[PDB]
RNA sequence: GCCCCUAAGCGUGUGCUAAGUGGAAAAGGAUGUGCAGUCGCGAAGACAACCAGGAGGUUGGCUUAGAAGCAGCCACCCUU
């Protein structure tokens, strides 16, 4: 939290990506820039790959927009913000993520109402 | 060892320390090793 | 154009002179004399730290509202006697600025 | 040098008050 | 060097090294200055050394002012001569410097370089001296 | 392993490959055969290929964007005529000219958009002092 | 300090025999002129005392300066040890006062040594990098300027120059054709050089005669008066010309210590050819990626690494 | 002056000194003390953070056979 800058980033992560249907979060460690570029190209249909300080994104989103999720902001996790898909493009974040060990998925915050363990073990199958 | 009344860093690597009640300059370059006396 | 006058409490001087001025400076108060068209030189002590802060933040030509035992008087720092070694304000000549 | 220095500096004592004969 | 074109009296009493400087105590020409903090007879050789140090540190640009002028002749009698038989001939040219006197002034765009050059000069000088600035 | 940019035309890639393959252990005749079989019709200007040394030998290739910034000098016929780039700017090929060749060479260019690739290519080329 | 001490010792050696009449006269003299309050330092200088004009003081100062000059000789020995041990070709610019020399150094290299039209502008020899055309590095050193009859008191002042001459490898002899009969200058410098050679019992090293100021010369001599010398080089440092010829003559005259080789360094070595390029003079290197044939003039230590890929031809 | 020599205080309160400084003297120099100011505070370190990426165009152009981010000169852009 750096005041002016944090406020601008709060605006960016509040009024530019929270307006989505599904909010996924991937814990990323050992991921190379090329690896994430390839994965993003694979999932170019959905998500936007936005990541910032967990405390910052918590204090921004969980208090201005989305509600009901806090534990997802205690580790190195990058948010997805599915553009228009619901679970159809979730394959690119499920199989192409679990084949690389790293990029561990979490979330499944469908229709921005309630949180779950991940919901991708069940709903991302389709 | 450069033993002079005045010891100062000669490069950005040199560090001024005070060891045994004595100002010295320690550096990765032994040429810049100094001591106050 | 103009700016808010800087507030400074300037108590009048009970005792004046060399010893009085030195003691005031030791206490940390720059002695001053406020004169001007009103034709009434007053002998004041401005808090040295606050006066110097005002001077260095708004410059020598900074208008000052001196609270002199409740009364507020506008005045500009006409002259500053500053010691060349200690660099402290030895004395201030303030000129009343009627509005 | 040392002798004169000591004889002169011993005037810097509380009893002498900064003065001594022959400095 | 700095030597007077002429002096009305070439065998003068030693300048009295007392009191702080009453004039020339602020930077009136340049942006930075060297203010003396002790009394000393700063000689023309010391002035020359200090100004050359400043000029060689600032290299190309910048302007240097030498506020003090060594116009006071300190005399010296011939070597291995007894006391008496008149006063010695003029030997050194000194400026009576007192605490608070600004000896040199410098204008140079780079503050660090200006301060380093003034530090050179101070090291050449025989007194404690600080770097003062026009901005009060 | 090593990008090892060598002439796209199979003329004589001796300076780059020789010393490079020296410590790598790859034999010159086999590598020349592999490179000749790779650059069959890919006779452009220059290709960088990643050998990807395996446990003993790989002979792998990785072509990404042979022309890259190096295409502008050979397109304008200016060659090594940019001493102080951005100062002694040469090869006045406008942006309306360089955009077509940039799109032509656009295969990977680490870019997902035409505008992004164009900006990257403009920045790369201008490093040699170009008046696009 | 070295130059000042040498000059002070020279002045005291000159003053000691003649301290009575001329000594007292110049002791009295306070005008601040040649000799009289001239000093032994430089700007301003110690004119008030000059050469101390006093037997006891002069002798004491002479002994002190002799000890000091021994110390400075040791210091210069240490300083020149690096060059002496590198065995790098040393080229000494000797010659008469004026006549470029310092200008010739600043031209053949990028140096900025003091170049003034006055006489005895250079009092300390100064060494610098130089690259022969063939690439052979060398050390070009400007020296102090000689005169027709150098005072015998300046032995210590000129000891540095004489030591540079003794080491030497080419002795670039700089003269100017814009003087009255430059052959007299040539002869004076040649006699001092021959005296040094006799003193140090060494073979006379090459002497590359070079003439400058030719641009400012009168050109009265066609080819045998203005260029009466058969193989003297003409440069005129100021207007760039002839300096390439001077460099070529330098390189030709300076015998090489390297050995020409034909080594076919493989392409799996890399370092053994990069170092050949680095310390060495590559030329006619084959572009074949297979065993090359680099005809470089490698130095002695590298010349022993041939049996790796020397081949036979 | 007041620990013993040596008369009277190993006096009282608070703090500082580590140098036997006290109990002799420029420049250089603190991980000693309070005091003040200026940045970062985001928790009396921050995006100098124990673990991760640190990329890509590209080996940016002059340079030679080598200049690969780091013989030497030019500025030093964009993408993600
Ligand atoms: N016109 C012209 N002038 C020259 C030439 N070479 C040198 N000069 C001038 O002659 C002067 C000689 O000074 P310098 O070059 O130092 O000669 P020098 O031998 O070092 C003098 P010293 O030996 O006492 O140090 C210089 O000021 C220089 O400008 C030349 O080729 N042409």
PDB file of N, CA and C and ligand atoms in Angstrom, chain G residues 96-103 114-122 142-145 212-216 235-238, ligand 1:
ATOM      1  N   UNK G  96      66.776  18.432 -29.896  1.00  0.00           N
ATOM      2  CA  UNK G  96      67.064  19.753 -29.362  1.00  0.00           C
ATOM      3  C   UNK G  96      65.805  20.373 -28.768  1.00  0.00           C
ATOM      4  N   UNK G  97      66.007  21.354 -27.891  1.00  0.00           N
ATOM      5  CA  UNK G  97      64.901  22.111 -27.321  1.00  0.00           C
ATOM      6  C   UNK G  97      64.018  22.659 -28.435  1.00  0.00           C
ATOM      7  N   UNK G  98      62.754  22.930 -28.132  1.00  0.00           N
ATOM      8  CA  UNK G  98      61.773  23.216 -29.186  1.00  0.00           C
ATOM      9  C   UNK G  98      61.814  22.028 -30.150  1.00  0.00           C
ATOM     10  N   UNK G  99      61.569  22.259 -31.438  1.00  0.00           N
ATOM     11  CA  UNK G  99      61.630  21.197 -32.439  1.00  0.00           C
ATOM     12  C   UNK G  99      60.614  20.099 -32.134  1.00  0.00           C
ATOM     13  N   UNK G 100      59.390  20.508 -31.820  1.00  0.00           N
ATOM     14  CA  UNK G 100      58.326  19.555 -31.578  1.00  0.00           C
ATOM     15  C   UNK G 100      58.620  18.622 -30.424  1.00  0.00           C
ATOM     16  N   UNK G 101      58.925  17.363 -30.733  1.00  0.00           N
ATOM     17  CA  UNK G 101      59.239  16.376 -29.709  1.00  0.00           C
ATOM     18  C   UNK G 101      58.031  16.134 -28.815  1.00  0.00           C
ATOM     19  N   UNK G 102      57.677  17.111 -27.980  1.00  0.00           N
ATOM     20  CA  UNK G 102      56.429  17.009 -27.234  1.00  0.00           C
ATOM     21  C   UNK G 102      55.238  16.990 -28.182  1.00  0.00           C
ATOM     22  N   UNK G 103      55.268  17.846 -29.206  1.00  0.00           N
ATOM     23  CA  UNK G 103      54.229  17.816 -30.228  1.00  0.00           C
ATOM     24  C   UNK G 103      54.229  16.486 -30.964  1.00  0.00           C
ATOM     25  N   UNK G 114      52.673  19.057 -21.953  1.00  0.00           N
ATOM     26  CA  UNK G 114      52.858  20.490 -22.136  1.00  0.00           C
ATOM     27  C   UNK G 114      53.645  20.765 -23.409  1.00  0.00           C
ATOM     28  N   UNK G 115      53.048  21.539 -24.310  1.00  0.00           N
ATOM     29  CA  UNK G 115      53.658  21.901 -25.586  1.00  0.00           C
ATOM     30  C   UNK G 115      53.640  23.422 -25.660  1.00  0.00           C
ATOM     31  N   UNK G 116      54.754  24.052 -25.297  1.00  0.00           N
ATOM     32  CA  UNK G 116      54.883  25.500 -25.323  1.00  0.00           C
ATOM     33  C   UNK G 116      56.063  25.887 -26.200  1.00  0.00           C
ATOM     34  N   UNK G 117      55.951  27.053 -26.836  1.00  0.00           N
ATOM     35  CA  UNK G 117      57.025  27.545 -27.690  1.00  0.00           C
ATOM     36  C   UNK G 117      58.272  27.923 -26.906  1.00  0.00           C
ATOM     37  N   UNK G 118      58.166  28.093 -25.592  1.00  0.00           N
ATOM     38  CA  UNK G 118      59.319  28.454 -24.785  1.00  0.00           C
ATOM     39  C   UNK G 118      60.301  27.288 -24.723  1.00  0.00           C
ATOM     40  N   UNK G 119      61.503  27.575 -24.239  1.00  0.00           N
ATOM     41  CA  UNK G 119      62.571  26.592 -24.153  1.00  0.00           C
ATOM     42  C   UNK G 119      62.512  25.880 -22.810  1.00  0.00           C
ATOM     43  N   UNK G 120      62.794  24.579 -22.830  1.00  0.00           N
ATOM     44  CA  UNK G 120      62.722  23.732 -21.643  1.00  0.00           C
ATOM     45  C   UNK G 120      61.307  23.741 -21.064  1.00  0.00           C
ATOM     46  N   UNK G 121      60.343  23.458 -21.939  1.00  0.00           N
ATOM     47  CA  UNK G 121      58.967  23.289 -21.496  1.00  0.00           C
ATOM     48  C   UNK G 121      58.758  21.941 -20.821  1.00  0.00           C
ATOM     49  N   UNK G 122      59.473  20.912 -21.269  1.00  0.00           N
ATOM     50  CA  UNK G 122      59.388  19.567 -20.708  1.00  0.00           C
ATOM     51  C   UNK G 122      60.619  19.338 -19.840  1.00  0.00           C
ATOM     52  N   UNK G 142      58.574  11.040 -24.458  1.00  0.00           N
ATOM     53  CA  UNK G 142      59.145  12.358 -24.680  1.00  0.00           C
ATOM     54  C   UNK G 142      60.123  12.664 -23.556  1.00  0.00           C
ATOM     55  N   UNK G 143      61.220  13.328 -23.897  1.00  0.00           N
ATOM     56  CA  UNK G 143      62.309  13.570 -22.962  1.00  0.00           C
ATOM     57  C   UNK G 143      62.566  15.069 -22.834  1.00  0.00           C
ATOM     58  N   UNK G 144      63.589  15.411 -22.053  1.00  0.00           N
ATOM     59  CA  UNK G 144      63.993  16.800 -21.885  1.00  0.00           C
ATOM     60  C   UNK G 144      64.846  17.215 -23.075  1.00  0.00           C
ATOM     61  N   UNK G 145      64.774  18.497 -23.423  1.00  0.00           N
ATOM     62  CA  UNK G 145      65.458  19.005 -24.596  1.00  0.00           C
ATOM     63  C   UNK G 145      66.902  19.384 -24.306  1.00  0.00           C
ATOM     64  N   UNK G 212      60.806  18.213 -38.498  1.00  0.00           N
ATOM     65  CA  UNK G 212      59.462  18.768 -38.461  1.00  0.00           C
ATOM     66  C   UNK G 212      59.538  20.278 -38.675  1.00  0.00           C
ATOM     67  N   UNK G 213      58.395  20.940 -38.524  1.00  0.00           N
ATOM     68  CA  UNK G 213      58.234  22.340 -38.899  1.00  0.00           C
ATOM     69  C   UNK G 213      58.452  22.557 -40.389  1.00  0.00           C
ATOM     70  N   UNK G 214      58.417  21.490 -41.189  1.00  0.00           N
ATOM     71  CA  UNK G 214      58.673  21.648 -42.616  1.00  0.00           C
ATOM     72  C   UNK G 214      57.598  22.513 -43.258  1.00  0.00           C
ATOM     73  N   UNK G 215      56.369  22.459 -42.740  1.00  0.00           N
ATOM     74  CA  UNK G 215      55.316  23.325 -43.258  1.00  0.00           C
ATOM     75  C   UNK G 215      55.673  24.793 -43.065  1.00  0.00           C
ATOM     76  N   UNK G 216      56.271  25.131 -41.923  1.00  0.00           N
ATOM     77  CA  UNK G 216      56.715  26.494 -41.666  1.00  0.00           C
ATOM     78  C   UNK G 216      58.135  26.751 -42.151  1.00  0.00           C
ATOM     79  N   UNK G 235      58.020  15.391 -41.077  1.00  0.00           N
ATOM     80  CA  UNK G 235      56.682  15.173 -40.534  1.00  0.00           C
ATOM     81  C   UNK G 235      55.898  16.474 -40.387  1.00  0.00           C
ATOM     82  N   UNK G 236      56.433  17.444 -39.645  1.00  0.00           N
ATOM     83  CA  UNK G 236      55.684  18.664 -39.352  1.00  0.00           C
ATOM     84  C   UNK G 236      54.371  18.355 -38.640  1.00  0.00           C
ATOM     85  N   UNK G 237      54.466  17.871 -37.401  1.00  0.00           N
ATOM     86  CA  UNK G 237      53.307  17.390 -36.652  1.00  0.00           C
ATOM     87  C   UNK G 237      52.081  18.290 -36.796  1.00  0.00           C
ATOM     88  N   UNK G 238      52.256  19.614 -36.785  1.00  0.00           N
ATOM     89  CA  UNK G 238      51.105  20.511 -36.706  1.00  0.00           C
ATOM     90  C   UNK G 238      50.085  20.206 -37.792  1.00  0.00           C
TER      91      UNK G 238
HETATM   92  N1  LIG I   1      54.669  25.125 -37.483  1.00  0.00           N
HETATM   93  C1  LIG I   1      55.061  24.070 -36.739  1.00  0.00           C
HETATM   94  N2  LIG I   1      55.232  24.255 -35.411  1.00  0.00           N
HETATM   95  C2  LIG I   1      55.621  23.238 -34.619  1.00  0.00           C
HETATM   96  C3  LIG I   1      55.860  21.925 -35.216  1.00  0.00           C
HETATM   97  N3  LIG I   1      56.232  21.115 -34.209  1.00  0.00           N
HETATM   98  C4  LIG I   1      56.233  21.846 -33.064  1.00  0.00           C
HETATM   99  N4  LIG I   1      55.868  23.109 -33.321  1.00  0.00           N
HETATM  100  C5  LIG I   1      55.755  24.192 -32.334  1.00  0.00           C
HETATM  101  O1  LIG I   1      57.021  24.405 -31.716  1.00  0.00           O
HETATM  102  C6  LIG I   1      56.889  24.498 -30.302  1.00  0.00           C
HETATM  103  C7  LIG I   1      57.903  23.553 -29.689  1.00  0.00           C
HETATM  104  O2  LIG I   1      57.458  23.110 -28.414  1.00  0.00           O
HETATM  105  P1  LIG I   1      57.440  21.536 -28.143  1.00  0.00           P
HETATM  106  O3  LIG I   1      56.616  20.878 -29.208  1.00  0.00           O
HETATM  107  O4  LIG I   1      57.137  21.300 -26.696  1.00  0.00           O
HETATM  108  O5  LIG I   1      58.982  21.225 -28.409  1.00  0.00           O
HETATM  109  P2  LIG I   1      59.905  20.652 -27.238  1.00  0.00           P
HETATM  110  O6  LIG I   1      61.026  19.866 -27.773  1.00  0.00           O
HETATM  111  O7  LIG I   1      59.122  19.676 -26.263  1.00  0.00           O
HETATM  112  C8  LIG I   1      60.417  22.014 -26.184  1.00  0.00           C
HETATM  113  P3  LIG I   1      61.334  21.204 -24.873  1.00  0.00           P
HETATM  114  O8  LIG I   1      62.227  20.187 -25.459  1.00  0.00           O
HETATM  115  O9  LIG I   1      62.193  22.279 -24.060  1.00  0.00           O
HETATM  116  O10 LIG I   1      60.256  20.515 -23.902  1.00  0.00           O
HETATM  117  C9  LIG I   1      55.446  24.162 -29.959  1.00  0.00           C
HETATM  118  O11 LIG I   1      54.814  25.287 -29.350  1.00  0.00           O
HETATM  119  C10 LIG I   1      54.767  23.805 -31.258  1.00  0.00           C
HETATM  120  O12 LIG I   1      53.536  24.502 -31.417  1.00  0.00           O
HETATM  121  C11 LIG I   1      55.654  21.806 -36.673  1.00  0.00           C
HETATM  122  O13 LIG I   1      55.834  20.722 -37.262  1.00  0.00           O
HETATM  123  N5  LIG I   1      55.264  22.890 -37.348  1.00  0.00           N
END
